From a paper:
We obtained a cryo-electron microscopy (cryo-EM) map of the DIX filaments with a global resolution of 3.6 Å, which enabled a near atomic resolution structure. Remarkably, unlike the single stranded fibers observed in crystals of Dvl2 DIX domains, in solution the Dvl2 DIX filament forms an antiparallel double helix. Successive protomers in the filament are related by a rotation of 48.0 ± 0.2° around the helical axis, with a rise of 13.5 ± 0.3 Å per protomer. The pitch of the helix is 101.3 Å, larger than the pitch of the single stranded helix observed in crystals of Dvl2 Y27D (85 Å) and Y27W/C80S (88 Å). The head-to-tail interface within each strand is similar to that observed in crystal structures. For example, Y27 packs against F56 and K68 of a neighboring protomer. We next tested the role of the inter-strand contacts that form the antiparallel double helix. These contacts are formed between two opposing protomers, principally by the β3-β4 (residues 60–66) and β4-β5 (residues 82–84) loops. Some residues on the β3-β4 loop (e.g., D63) participate in intra- and inter-strand interactions, whereas others appear to be involved solely in inter-strand contacts, including M60, G65 and N82. The structural, biochemical and signaling data indicate that the double stranded DIX filament is stabilized by inter-strand, antiparallel contacts that are functionally important.
A current model for signal transduction is that ligand-bound Fzd recruits the cytosolic protein Dishevelled (Dvl), which then binds to Axin and thereby recruits the destruction complex to the activated receptor complex. The Dvl-Axin interaction is essential for Wnt/β-catenin signal transduction and is mediated by a DIX (Dvl and Axin interacting) domain present in each protein. Dvl has an N-terminal DIX domain, as well as a PDZ and a DEP domain; the DEP domain mediates the interaction with Fzd. We found that purified Dvl DIX in solution forms antiparallel, double-stranded filaments whose stability depends on the inter-strand interactions in the double helix.
Residue numbers in the entry:
A (entry chain C), B (entry chain D), C (entry chain E), D (entry chain F), E (entry chain K), F (entry chain L), ...: 13 to 90
The structure:
C-alpha cells in the first residue's frame, strides 16, 4: 500500500490516495486511473536528482515507474 | 454521536450530518448512505499525515475507518 | 410565531412559512407537515458550529429541534 | 382597487385579477374566492423580509392581510 | 463600537475591524482609515433596498454613512 | 440621484450604484465610467417592450440613454 | 502556556510561538513583543462571530485580549 | 534520453522533463512542445561562455540547438 | 549524531551542521553553540502541530529540546 | 551576430541574447525590444573611457550605438 | 589531484586549489593547511542530502573527509 | 611577450608586468622572478573552469604553467 500524496495548481492543502499496489512496480497509469481527471494534466512527481537535488519530474509515459521519494510518492497536478 | 462536516465543489458553506454510530467504528458506507448522491463522488476526508500535515485523503473502500480529525470528521465531495 | 425561511435547489428566491409554535419546541415534523412535499427531501438547516462556522445541517429526525439561527430558522430543501 | 398579479406552477405568463377592496384590508380568502381553484393550493405571496429581502410567504389563514409589495400584490400558486 | 465585517475578492473567510465611533454616524472614511488599502478599492456594502431586497451598494464618498444591515455593517472589497 | 441596480453573470445578489446625474439624462458611458470593468462587458438593461413585456436589451452606445423601469434602472453584466 | 500560531502574507506554512502567560489574560502587545516585526503589521486573529461564523478580526490595541478559537490562538500578519 | 532540468520565475524547486531524443540534435521547439505553456515565455538556457563563464542565454529560434552544459540541459523560464 | 539542517533569510539553499549529542536530548543551546551568529536570531524549527499540520515554531530557551520532525531537525534563521 | 551579455541588479549570473544584426549598427532599441522589460530600466553598457578605464555608461537614446567592448557588448540592467 | 573550488563571504567569483592527494581520502585539515586563513572560518561544503537535496554542510573536524559532490569538492568560507 | 596584469589585496588599480617569454610556456616562477615579492604570497590566476565558469586558481609550483584567460594572464596577489 502506497500513500500517493499529490497537490493541484492553486489549492493549498495536499490530497492523498491509497494505491493497492506496493512501491516497486507502481506506475503513472495506476495513479492516473483512480483520479478521474477530465483532461490531460501535468503529472509532476517529486524525485531526487543527483545534480540539482529535489526535482518535480513530469511523467507522461504510463510504463514509467513512480519515483519513491523516501518511500512516499509526492506528486503534483497542473 | 459524530457530526461529520462535508463540503462540495463550488458551494461556499459546509454541511453537517448527524450520524448515530460513535467515532471508533464509523466507515465510509455509513456516511455514503445518508447522503443519497446520484453518481460516484470523490469522498475526501481530512486526515493528519506524519510527513505533510493536514491532507484530504480520498476513501473509496467502504470498510475503511473514517479519519476523525481532532474528533471532527471534516469531509469533501467532488 | 416563527418565520421559518427556506430555499429550494434551483429557485433563487427564498420562501417563508408562518409556524404557530414558538422557537423553543419547534421540530422537524412541524415544519415538514405544512409543506406537503411529495417525496423525501433533504431538510438542511442553517446552524452555527463552534468549529467551522455556519453549517447547513441535515435533519431527518422529527424529534430533533430546529436550530434557531439568531431567532430566524433558515432552511434548505433538496 | 388592487390588481393582484399571480402566477402558477408551470405556465410562464402571469395572470391578473381585480379585487374590489383596497390595499389596506385585502385578505387571503377574498383573493381565494375569485380563483375557483379545485383543491387546496399553496398561496405564496411576495413579501419584503428585513433579513433576506424578497421572500414568497405562504399564507393559509384567511384573516391574514396580503403583503402589499410596493402596492402590487405579486403571488404564486402550487 | 461597530463590528464592520468585510470580505475580499478571492478570500472566502471574512475579516472584522473595530471602529471607535458608534453605528449611528459611522462613515466610509472611518472604515477607510483602519484598512490602508494599497490601491483604490471598491467598497460595496450590504444594504436593504425596497424594490430588490438585499443589495451590495458601492459607496465612494468618504463622508457617506454606512448601511447598518440588521445592526451589522457587512462590506465587500474589490 | 439614480440607484442603478446591476447584476453579474453568476452572482446571485445584485449590486447598487449611486450616480450623480438624474434619471432624465443618464447614459451608458456615464454608468460605464463608475464601474471600471476590466473588459468589454454586455450591458443588458431591463426595459419594457410593447409586444413582449419586459426585456433585457443590450446597450453598446455610450451616449445612449438608459431605460428606466418604473423609476429604477435595472441592469445586467456579461 | 499558549501556542499562538500565526501566518504571514505570502508564506503558506504557518509559524508557532510559545507565550509564557496563560490563555485567560493573553494580550496583543504581549504577542507583539515576542515577534519584533520591522514595521506596523496588521494583526488579524481568527475569531467566532455569531452572525457569520469564523472571522479574522483585526486587533490593534496592545491591551486587547486575543480570541481563543477552540483554545488555539490562530493569527495572521500583514 | 536527455533530462532537461528547468526552473520558473518564482517557484524555488526545479522541474524535469524526460526528452526522447539524444543530446546532439535537441532543439528548442522539441522542449517547447512538451511544456504546453500558454504564452511566449523567455526560454533561458545555461551555457558556458568562454569570456564570462556560466551564462543563461535566451533562445527563441526553434532551429537552435540546446546548450548541453556538462550533458545536462539546465534551463529557466520567465 | 544529528544532521540539523537549517536555512537562512534570503539564501535558498540550506545548510547542515553535525551535533555531537544524540537526537533524543538535543537542545537549542547545543545547536546555538556551533553557529556563532553575530546577533540574536530567530530560531524557527519545523514541528508537527496536531491542529494545523507542519509549523515552524520559534524556540528561544537554550535548554528547550528540538522537534525531531521525522528524525530530521529542520530549522530556519531570522 | 552579436552575443550581448547583460546582468541585472541582484542576480549573480549573467544573461545572453543573440542579436541578428552585426556589431557596426547595433543600437539600444534593437537590444531593448528583445528583452520585453515591464518598465523603463537603466541600460548601462560597458565602455572603455580614455580617462578612467572601464565605465558603465547609461544609454537612453535608441539611435545611440552600443559600445563594442573588445567585440563583446557587456551590459547591465537596473 | 582534486580541484577544491571554494567561495568567500562577499566575493562573487570563486577560487580553486589544486590539492596533491586524490578524492578518496581528502580531509578538511589537508584543505585547511593550504589556505592559511587568518582566523577560524566556517567551512561549508556542498553535499547531497537524501531528504532535501543539495546542502552546504559545515565540517569542523580536520580528519573528516570532504563530500565529492559529482567529483568536484565545492566549498564555502565564513 | 606577455602582459601579465595582476592585482594586489586592497589596491583597486591593476598592475602590468612584461615577461620576456611567450604565452605558450610561461610559468609561475618566471612570473615570480620579475616581482620580487617580500614574502610568500598567494598567486591566484584567473582561469576558466568547465563546471563553474571563471575561477581564480592558486598556483604554487614554480614550474606550473599559467592559465591564459583569453590570451591575457589576469592574476591576483594575497
Amino acid at each position: 500500500e502506497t500513500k500517493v500524496i499529490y497537490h493541484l495548481d492553486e489549492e493549498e492543502t495536499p490530497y492523498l490516495v491509497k494505491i493497492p499496489v506496493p512501491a516497486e512496480r507502481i506506475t503513472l497509469g495506476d495513479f492516473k486511473s483512480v483520479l478521474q481527471r477530465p483532461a490531460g494534466a501535468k503529472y509532476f512527481f517529486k524525485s531526487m536528482d543527483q545534480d540539482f537535488g529535489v526535482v518535480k519530474e513530469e511523467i507522461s509515459d504510463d510504463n514509467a515507474r513512480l519515483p519513491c521519494f523516501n518511500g512516499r510518492v509526492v506528486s503534483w497536478l497542473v
